[PDB]
């Protein structure tokens, strides 16, 4: 085989050139933009090859760690556009550190706890910042952040009684949920609701009445899921929908066959990463939204007794995804991003890493099979495909809260 | 009156007409996390927003204030919510507000709050007369703006404006036939009007799509639409289609075509087709071809299909 200091890459095989776009000599904005990215990605790919010498890929853990550690405390005014998403910035950054297996100092953890306490609304849930009305986006983030910390201090900050009432004040009769009082409706809300409801153990039989049916109505002709019935299939909304139904144990309400074929077709044959919608550009953050769908599907199919399921791999190109993230998505200065030419940000950092972890780890039943491309150190901590927080963290939290009664219900 | 960037703009803490109310600083606690180093202007406006909100001051001054808070951060849903409360309490001219939102959306077309705001305004006025034209302008700048398409579907369905959408669809498909958001809108318009059960409609669509496939063979959108409008009934239900594709294969053996063929075989085997052994064999050969050469990025998916076919139809 190869010496330990050289590792052949899928993206560098001579035949990989064949995967370049074929625009049938008919150019439109779509092919033109796709070709441009491909041109840049080929350049990047080539920079990691030195004829028959192909050095091991390296995740720059330390540079990332220092970028994160800084942001957890302070952020420039460039983040003014996320002032209504601070608990979300919390979750992004903590999960990134979690994935990187970088410990959280007791002091920082307690400060985060207090901050999230200040963001909790008296009517229940969490807002984008202190004094802000509650919103499922930040509510989702705030609960995940508290579960990543996993201390009883963190756990108890959540006012479960009001949280349930808040979920109720957003429930629509057709099964859907508003994102916040007087707000917009789409599948993100069903996933936020179910995520926090199941973790904190506050699910009542009626809370999610008609929700699975509503989510199914969101799967479309493409096979993926849209934000609302009728809209285009989209990686983000699709992750939201499936994970929500997995929580409700209703995955069967969807055409899993069309969904599987849709999502696998979303991995770019040349880039190795995922696009969010058919005929759109590759983007590092979909590495999780899209690729994350495979483990959910595997679980759904496995529960149905599918005899043809793999016992060692996810139904996507795990290596290819790892090559896209490691060679195209890292900022030399630390942090990860969309694609070469884009600037870093905590959102992309969180999700690029989330996907890299799903791409390196396979698990099903008593079967575990890792595929860590590059230097061994690249290995990231596993992540729960439904909640996207440490699997250990999910178990700890659910165990804790299962010990408390469902607020005012029996 | 005066914008945040106007030369004559004056911080709220310096405005005489605001002197009577004390600004409410944001309480981030003694040891802040994810603390944003706001600009003086930003903090100024938010300290005063906090004040009016805390006091629930339904005033014209507060209403003007939200406009500045929104320009500072249009993603702040709390401001938006309060703004709508004021629109009602003060009985503001909603047509004036529509012009406002129109400008806002033009500046930031990928924001959730702005579109939701415009939908609320259209609900209140029960007036969609400006919708299609406006949306079309947004789409003219970004043909695939998701929020734009979603809003358009809502307007059409809620106010039953189907009459000219299919034409719109063709227009855009001519501009960029790779626009997946447009193929979706097509399914949206047809399934909601004539439906696809009319066999004359189905044939028109199958023809149109095949014609687009011939013009641009590697355009995945068309292929997905073809499989989309025929899948429910069953790909194996359309025997001529298989023949046509088999004829094009030697000259257009793209992964899309080969894949479509496996999809057909799949459905055939599922409906007790004749020559089961022969069909299975051709299907497995294609799965291998896609996994090893034509669509390797999906090697695992194809290998799975291969095994599924065997577990379901080997006998």
């Amino acid at each position: 085989s190869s010496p330990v200091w050289s590792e052949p890459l899928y993206s560098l095989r001579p035949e990989h050139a064949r995967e370049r776009l074929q625009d049938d000599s008919v150019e439109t904005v779509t092919s033109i933009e796709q070709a441009k990215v491909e041109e840049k990605i080929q350049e990047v790919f080539s920079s990691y090859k030195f004829n028959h010498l192909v050095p091991r890929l390296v995740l720059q853990r330390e540079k990332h760690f220092h970028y994160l550690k800084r942001g957890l405390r302070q952020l420039t005014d460039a983040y003014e556009c996320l002032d209504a998403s601070r608990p979300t910035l919390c979750y992004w950054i903590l999960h990134s550190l979690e994935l990187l297996d970088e410990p959280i100092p007791q002091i920082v953890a307690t400060d985060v706890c207090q901050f999230l306490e200040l963001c909790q609304s008296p009517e229940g849930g969490f807002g984008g910042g202190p004094g802000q009305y509650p919103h499922l986006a930040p509510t989702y983030a705030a609960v995940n952040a508290l579960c990543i910390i996993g201390t009883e201090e963190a756990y108890d900050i959540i006012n479960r009684e009001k949280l349930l009432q808040y979920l109720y004040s957003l429930k629509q009769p057709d099964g859907s949920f508003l994102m916040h009082v007087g707000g917009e409706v789409d599948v993100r809300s069903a996933y936020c609701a179910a995520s926090v409801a199941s973790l904190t153990n506050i699910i009542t039989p009626d809370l999610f009445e008609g929700t699975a049916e509503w989510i199914a109505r969101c799967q479309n002709w493409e096979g993926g899921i849209g934000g609302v019935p009728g809209m285009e299939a989209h990686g983000g909304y699709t992750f939201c929908g499936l994970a929500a139904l997995v929580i409700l144990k209703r995955e069967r309400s969807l055409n899993l066959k069309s969904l599987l074929q849709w999502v696998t077709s979303r991995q770019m044959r040349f880039e190795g990463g995922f696009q969010g919608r058919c005929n759109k550009l590759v983007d590092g953050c979909y590495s999780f939204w899209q690729a994350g769908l495979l483990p959910l599907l595997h679980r759904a199919l496995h529960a149905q007794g599918d005899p043809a399921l793999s016992m060692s791999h996810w139904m996507f190109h795990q290596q290819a995804l790892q090559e896209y993230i490691l060679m195209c998505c890292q900022c030399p200065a630390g942090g990860l991003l969309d694609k070469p030419g884009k600037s870093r940000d905590f959102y992309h950092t969180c999700f690029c890493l989330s996907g890299l972890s799903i791409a390196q780890h396979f698990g099903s039943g008593a079967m575990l099979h890792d595929v860590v491309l590059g230097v061994p150190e690249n290995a990231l901590q596993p992540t729960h495909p439904v909640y996207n927080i440490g699997p250990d963290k999910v178990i700890q939290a659910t165990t804790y809260f299962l010990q408390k009664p469902v607020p005012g219900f029996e | 009156f005066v914008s945040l960037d106007s030369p004559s703009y004056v911080l709220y803490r310096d405005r005489a007409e605001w002197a009577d109310i004390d600004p409410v600083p944001q309480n981030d606690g003694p040891n802040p996390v994810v603390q944003i180093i706001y600009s003086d202007k930003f903090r100024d406006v938010y300290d005063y927003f906090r004040a009016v909100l805390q006091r629930d001051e339904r005033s014209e001054r507060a209403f003007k204030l939200t406009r500045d808070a929104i320009e500072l951060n249009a993603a702040n849903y709390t401001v938006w919510h309060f703004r709508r409360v004021l629109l009602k309490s003060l009985q503001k001219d909603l047509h004036e507000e529509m012009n406002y939102i129109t400008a806002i959306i033009e500046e930031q077309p990928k924001n959730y709050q702005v579109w939701h705001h415009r939908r609320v305004l259209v609900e209140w006025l029960r007036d969609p007369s400006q919708e299609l034209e406006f949306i079309a302008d947004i789409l003219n700048q970004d043909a695939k703006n998701y929020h734009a398409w979603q809003h358009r579907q809502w307007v059409i369905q809620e106010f039953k404006l189907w009459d000219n959408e299919l034409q719109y669809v063709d227009q855009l498909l001519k501009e960029d036939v790779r626009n997946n958001s447009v193929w979706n809108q097509r399914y949206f318009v047809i399934s909601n009007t004539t439906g696809y059960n009319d066999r004359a409609v189905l044939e028109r669509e199958v023809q149109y799509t095949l014609e687009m496939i011939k013009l641009v063979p590697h355009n995945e959108s068309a292929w997905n639409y073809l499989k989309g409008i025929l899948q429910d009934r069953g790909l194996s239900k359309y025997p001529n289609l298989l023949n046509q594709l088999l004829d094009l294969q030697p000259s257009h053996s793209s992964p899309y075509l080969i894949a479509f063929l496996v999809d057909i075989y799949e459905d055939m085997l599922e409906n007790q087709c004749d020559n089961k052994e022969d069909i299975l064999n051709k299907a497995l050969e294609l799965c291998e071809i896609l996994a090893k050469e034509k669509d390797t990025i999906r090697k695992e998916y194809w290998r799975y299909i291969g095994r599924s076919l065997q577990s379901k139809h080997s006998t």
């Binding site: 998403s85 986006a137 930040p138 993100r188 983007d283 969309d338 992309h348 | 993603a75 959730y112």
Partner: peptide, 4 residues
């Protein structure tokens, strides 16, 4: 890329 805004989530909310």
């Amino acid at each position: 890329c805004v989530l909310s």
